[PDB]
Amino acid sequence: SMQEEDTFRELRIFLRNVTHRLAIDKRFRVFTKPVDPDEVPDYVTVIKQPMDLSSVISKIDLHKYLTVKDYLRDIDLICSNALEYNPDRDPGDRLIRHRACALRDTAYAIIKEELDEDFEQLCEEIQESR
Ligand SMILES: CC(=O)N[C@@H](C)C(=O)NCC#CBr
Numbered sequence: 001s002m003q004e005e006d007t008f009r010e011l012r013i014f015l016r017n018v019t020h021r022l023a024i025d026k027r028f029r030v031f032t033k034p035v036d037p038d039e040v041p042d043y044v045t046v047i048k049q050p051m052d053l054s055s056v057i058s059k060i061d062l063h064k065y066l067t068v069k070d071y072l073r074d075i076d077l078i079c080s081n082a083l084e085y086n087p088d089r090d091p092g093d094r095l096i097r098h099r100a101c102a103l104r105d106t107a108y109a110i111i112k113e114e115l116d117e118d119f120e121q122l123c124e125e126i127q128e129s130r
């Protein structure tokens, strides 16, 4: 229905706003673009589903997220990819892991404060209906 299309459009507006707020944070610059294969040619071999915030924006606009849970799966991938690819004790790896965990925690904290639970439940019930 048009009511359902309005619902998903509101979801995309909300997700674009959350994603923009993460992308402008200087801590998260490394996560705004895909890893460059030049610098890191073993990346695309270790990490089977690369994810970054530009990929997330593209997915929002392709109507790939019908719930906030589906969006958070991709935010969690940004974090888990960084924990897997950069697991060492040296400062460069610890800094990337801390920034990745912080991205993920920031996204979850914005959604806790600003997502109405009944809105998410409506999205889930339309998605389940299709
Ligand atoms: C996202 C990720 O895991 N990237 C690894 C390869 C990394 O060491 N990044 C440093 C930088 C920059 Br900007």
Ligand SMILES: [Cl-]
Pocket: none
């Ligand atoms: Cl830096």
